[PDB]
Design a protein around this ligand. Structure first.
Ligand SMILES: NC(=O)c1ccc[n+]([C@@H]2O[C@H](COP(=O)([O-])OP(=O)(O)OC[C@H]3O[C@@H](n4cnc5c(N)ncnc54)[C@H](OP(=O)(O)O)[C@@H]3O)[C@@H](O)[C@H]2O)c1
Ligand SMILES: NC(=O)c1ccc[n+]([C@@H]2O[C@H](COP(=O)([O-])OP(=O)(O)OC[C@H]3O[C@@H](n4cnc5c(N)ncnc54)[C@H](OP(=O)(O)O)[C@@H]3O)[C@@H](O)[C@H]2O)c1
Ligand SMILES: NC(=O)c1ccc[n+]([C@@H]2O[C@H](COP(=O)([O-])OP(=O)(O)OC[C@H]3O[C@@H](n4cnc5c(N)ncnc54)[C@H](OP(=O)(O)O)[C@@H]3O)[C@@H](O)[C@H]2O)c1
Ligand SMILES: NC(=O)c1ccc[n+]([C@@H]2O[C@H](COP(=O)([O-])OP(=O)(O)OC[C@H]3O[C@@H](n4cnc5c(N)ncnc54)[C@H](OP(=O)(O)O)[C@@H]3O)[C@@H](O)[C@H]2O)c1
Ligand SMILES: Nc1nc2ccc(Cl)cc2[nH]1
Ligand SMILES: Nc1nc2ccc(Cl)cc2[nH]1
Ligand SMILES: Nc1nc2ccc(Cl)cc2[nH]1
Ligand SMILES: Nc1nc2ccc(Cl)cc2[nH]1
Lengths: 249, 248, 249, 249
C-alpha cells in the first residue's frame, strides 16, 4: 500500500509541482483547490492516467470563519475516504496581497490573509494529528519574513504565525512520531498579475543565478523533508531562496 | 501640553504598571480594560488624584469579530476625545491559555488568542496611524522560539505580533512613527499558580532566579517611548533575565 | 563614591560619545585607545576639567596575539588602579575593512578583525569578571550581521562571534550579578574614508529619517543598558538602526 | 569522471559517516585527519576496496597559526592532485571543550577552538574558491548556538563565526555558482569522554524519540545539500536536532 499526501492549493504553480513530485515518489495525492476547478481536475486526470486511483480533488475555501474547522476536517477526511490513510500534509494554499496601514473590507482581508496562511494550517494540523510509518507536515513559509514587502503587514503576520505553528506543532507532535517542518521560498514563480518590469527587478536581486526558483526546486525541498533522509528533522525551516534574504538594502 | 498614551489591558499587572510609569513620566492615559472595571476605575481615580483630568477608562472586547475594527477605532478615538492627541499606543492586552492539538470551541480560541495578541494590535495600529515623538510598543514574548507545550494558538499570536512590529516599523517610519517591542520571559506569574510551581520557573532564570516585576517590564517600555530611543524602530527588547538562553 | 567604566576605542566617534555620556551620567572613565593618542588625551583633558580626577587614558593593541590576554588584563587593572573599582565595560574598539575570498597577510587580517571584534571582548570579559552594585558589560555589535557587506567575511565572522560571546557571557556571569548586553548600530557615523556620495547611498536606505544615527543616539542605548532601568536585562542585543535591517534588497 | 569531495576530520564519527555517504553516492574523497592516522587509512582502505583509487588521506593541524593558511591550501591542493578536481568541501573538523570565564593556555584554546570551527573553514573556503558543475560547501554548525552549553564561550563564539562565514561566503561566492550551506546537529554521537548517565540526560530531552541522531542522519542532510535537489539553496543552515532546540529550560 502506497502512502498518501494532502497538498493544499495544489491546482497550480508551486502546489502543483509539489503534488506532481509527491506522486512521482510513490504517493497517492489529494489535490485541494479553491477556485481553480478545471486545473485541479486536469491534474488528477494526468496523475491517474499514470497510476490509476492515486489522485482525487477536494474543494475548500480556507478563509477564516466559524466553519473553517469543519472544512479543514473535511480535507483530511477526504484523504482517508479515498486512500484509507494520510501520511503527509503540505500547507501550501495562501492569499498574498497588500493591506496598507494608512474593495475588500478589513474584516475580509484579516480572514483571508490570516486564515489561509495561518489558521487553516493550524486546523489542518489538528485534524491531521487527531486522525492518526513516516508521518510529517510541511508548511510553505517565506524567506523574506524579517525583511517584509512594504504594506504587506497582514500577509507577513500570517507567515510569522506559520513559523510559530511549525515550531509549536513540531514540539507537541514529536511523541506521536509526526515531524513538522517548513520550506521558505524567497522568489520563485512570480505573481501572475506582477508586471514584467517588477519581475526582472526581483530577478536581478538574487545572488545565485539572478533568477527565481522553478516550482520544481521548491518541491525538491518538500520531498527531502517528507523522505526517510529527514527522519531526525523536525521544527526546521529550509530557505530555498538563492541567497536573496542575505542581501542588505 | 502633555502627551497622551493608550494602554490596552491596563487595569492590572503589567499593563497597570506601564500606565502608572507613563503617567508619572507626564503622560495623560487612556486605561483600556475588558472585564476588570473596578480595577480600571480605581486606577483612573488614583491617577486623577495625582493630576486632575489626566486619566480616562475605555471598555472593549479585543476578540476577533466583525466589530473589532470599530472597537479599535473607538479606543483610539477616545484618546483624541479625552486629550486632543494620541502620541503613544501600547498593545498589552492578551489572552493566554493552552490550545492542545490533540469549554470554548476552537473557533472562539482562535478569535480570542489571535484577536488579542495580533489582530487587535494591527487594527489599533491602523487607526492610530490614520489619525496622525510618536511610537507604538507591542508586548511580545521572549520564549516565542521555545514555546510552552500545547500553546500553539497563543504562540502563533505572539509570532504574528513580531511580524506586525517589523512590518509597521517599516511602513510607518516615513510618518515618523516608531514601532518597537518589549519581550518578557517570566514576569508576574498567573494569579492561580502555586508557589511551588512559580518556583520551578523562577529557578530557571539565570539573573537572580526570580521573575521580572511589572515595573521592570514597564521600564523598557518607558525607554522605547522616550527621546533616548528616537532612532530605534523595529526592535524587540527582551526583558527576561537570560531565560531564553537556557537550553533544555 | 562614583562608579567607573572602561570604554575601548574611546578616543573618537561612537566610543568617545559613549565615554562622554557615561561621564555626564556620573561615571569615572578609562579611555582606551590604540593609535589615537592625541584625541584620547584631548578627551580626558575635557572630562577632567569638568570634574577633576575622573578620566584616564590607556593604550593597548587589541590585535590577537599570545600577549593579548596580558594586555586586556592590564586595561581592567588600570581602571582599578585609577578608581578602585570597575563597574562597566563597553567593548567598542573594532577593526573594519574588506577581506575578499577570491597589504596585510591573511594571518594579520584574522588577528585584527577577529582579535578586536571577538577575542579581546572575550579576554576583557574574563578579566572584568575575575577582578570582581550594578555591574554590566555592553558589546557594540552590528544590526547588519545577517545581511552582511559583500567581501567582509572576517569582520562579519568577528561580529557573529561577539553575539555568541554576549549570549554565553550573559548566561555564565548572571550568577555573579554581571549583566551582558549589546547595542547594534546599522548605519551611524560613516567611515572617514567614505566620500559624501557613498554616504548618501547608505543614508537613503534608512526608513526612519533617511539618515545615519548620531553617535549620541547609539550612546543613549548603551546608557539605558547600564542603568537601573535595565536591571533585569541580560543577553539582549538592542538594534539602533532606524529600521535599516528590515529593508529588503 | 566522478566528482570529488574534501571532508575535514573525516576519520571518525560524523566526518566518517559523511565521507562514507559521499563515496556511496559516487564521490571520490579526501579524508582529512589530525591525530587519527590509523582510522583514516582504515577508512581509505575500505572505500578503495569498494572502488580502486577513489579515496586518499590528508594530514593537517587546523589550529590557528602562521602556517594555517598554507595548511588549508594544501588540503585543497591534495584533492586536485589526487582527483584533478574539487567539487565539495565539508567543514566538519572541530575542537570542543569548556573554557570557563571565571593544561592549555587561554591563547592555545583560542587558537584551537576559533581556528578549527571558524578560521580554518574560512581559509579552506578561500582556497576552494580560488582554485575554481555543482560546487558547494557544507559547514558543520550547531543547533544549540543560541542556547549554548554553560562555560563554552570560545566554542560557541567559533560556531557563531561559522554561521557568519556560511552567510558571507554564500553571498560572495554565488556569482561563481558556488553554494554555501550548513548542517546543524543538536545531540548526535555524544563525546567519548561524556559520562553514561550524562548522555542519557541529553537523550531524554530530545522531543523526537528521546535519542540522539545517528552520524548517518547528519550525513543525510549533507548529501541533500550537495545534490542537484538543493541547486537553488545557499546561505541556508538545516537543523537536524529532533526538536531539541525548541525545548525551553
Ligand atoms: N515566489 C513565490 O511564489 C513565493 C515566495 C515566498 C513564499 N511563497 C509561498 O509558497 C506557497 C506557494 O506559492 P505560490 O505562489 O505557488 O502560491 P499562490 O499561487 O499565490 O497560491 C496558491 C493557491 O492558494 C490558494 N488560495 C488562495 N486563497 C485561498 C483561499 N481563500 N482558500 C483556499 N485556497 C486559497 C489558491 O487556490 P485556487 O487557485 O484553487 O483558488 C492558489 O492557487 C505559498 O504559501 C506562498 O506564500 C511563494
Ligand atoms: N506575565 C508574564 O510573565 C508574561 C510573559 C511573557 C509575555 N507577557 C506579555 O506581556 C503582556 C502583559 O502580561 P500580563 O501577565 O500582565 O497579562 P495578563 O494579566 O495575562 O492580561 C492582561 C490583560 O489583557 C486583557 N485581556 C484578556 N483578554 C482580553 C480580551 N478578550 N479583550 C480585551 N482585553 C483582554 C485583560 O483585561 P481585563 O482584566 O480587563 O479583562 C487582562 O487584564 C501580555 O501581552 C503578555 O502576553 C507576559
Ligand atoms: N559606525 C557605524 O556606522 C557602525 C555600524 C555598525 C556597527 N558599528 C560598531 O560600533 C562600534 C563603534 O563604531 P565606530 O565607527 O565608532 O568605530 P571605528 O571608528 O571604526 O573604530 C573605533 C576604534 O577602534 C579602535 N581599534 C581599531 N583597531 C584596533 C586595534 N587593533 N587595537 C585596539 N583598538 C583598535 C580604534 O582606536 P584608535 O583610533 O585609538 O587607534 C578606533 O578609533 C564598533 O564596534 C563598530 O563595529 C558601527
Ligand atoms: N556530535 C554531536 O552531537 C554534535 C553536536 C553539535 C554539533 N556538532 C558538529 O558536528 C561536527 C562533527 O561532530 P563530531 O562529534 O563528529 O566531532 P568530533 O568527534 O568532536 O571531532 C571531529 C574531528 O575533528 C578533528 N579535529 C579536532 N581538533 C582538530 C585540530 N586542531 N586540527 C585538525 N582537526 C581537528 C579531529 O580529528 P582527528 O581525530 O583526526 O584528530 C576529530 O576526530 C563538528 O563540527 C561539531 O561541532 C556535533
Ligand atoms: N501566496 C504567495 N505568497 C507569496 C509571497 C511572495 C511572492 Cl513573490 C508570491 C507569493 N504568493
Ligand atoms: N497574556 C500572557 N501571556 C503570557 C505568557 C507567559 C506568562 Cl507566565 C503569562 C502570560 N500572560
Ligand atoms: N568598526 C566598525 N564597524 C563598522 C561597521 C559599519 C560601519 Cl558604517 C562602520 C564600522 N566601523
Ligand atoms: N566538535 C564537537 N562539537 C560538539 C557539540 C556538541 C556535541 Cl554533543 C559534540 C561536539 N563535538
Amino acid at each position: 500500500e502506497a502512502p498518501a499526501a494532502v497538498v493544499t492549493g495544489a491546482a497550480k504553480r508551486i502546489g502543483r509541482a509539489i503534488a506532481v513530485k509527491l506522486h512521482q515518489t510513490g504517493y497517492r495525492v489529494v489535490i485541494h483547490y479553491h477556485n481553480s476547478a478545471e486545473a485541479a481536475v486536469s491534474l488528477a486526470d494526468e496523475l491517474n492516467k499514470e497510476r490509476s486511483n492515486t489522485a482525487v480533488v477536494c474543494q475548500a475555501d480556507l478563509t477564516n470563519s466559524n466553519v473553517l474547522p469543519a472544512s479543514c476536517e473535511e480535507i483530511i477526511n477526504s484523504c482517508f475516504r479515498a486512500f484509507g490513510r494520510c501520511d503527509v500534509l503540505v500547507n501550501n494554499a495562501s492569499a498574498f496581497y497588500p493591506t496598507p496601514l494608512v474593495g475588500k473590507t478589513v474584516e475580509t482581508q484579516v480572514a483571508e490573509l490570516i486564515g489561509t496562511n495561518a489558521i487553516a494550517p493550524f486546523l489542518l494540523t489538528m485534524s491531521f494529528a487527531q486522525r492518526q510509518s513516516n508521518l510529517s507536515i510541511v508548511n510553505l513559509c517565506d524567506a523574506m519574513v524579517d525583511q517584509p514587502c512594504m504594506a504587506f503587514s497582514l500577509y507577513n503576520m500570517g507567515k510569522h504565525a506559520l513559523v510559530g505553528l511549525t515550531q509549536s506543532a513540531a514540539l507537541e507532535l514529536a511523541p506521536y512520531g509526526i515531524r513538522v517542518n517548513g520550506v521558505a521560498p524567497g522568489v520563485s514563480l512570480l505573481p501572475v498579475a506582477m508586471g514584467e518590469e517588477e519581475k526582472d527587478k526581483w530577478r536581478r536581486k538574487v545572488p545565485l543565478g539572478r533568477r527565481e526558483a522553478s516550482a520544481e526546486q521548491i518541491a525538491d525541498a518538500v520531498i527531502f523533508l517528507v523522505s526517510g533522509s529527514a527522519q531526525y528533522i523536525t521544527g526546521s525551516i529550509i530557505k530555498v531562496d538563492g541567497g536573496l534574504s542575505l542581501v542588505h538594502a
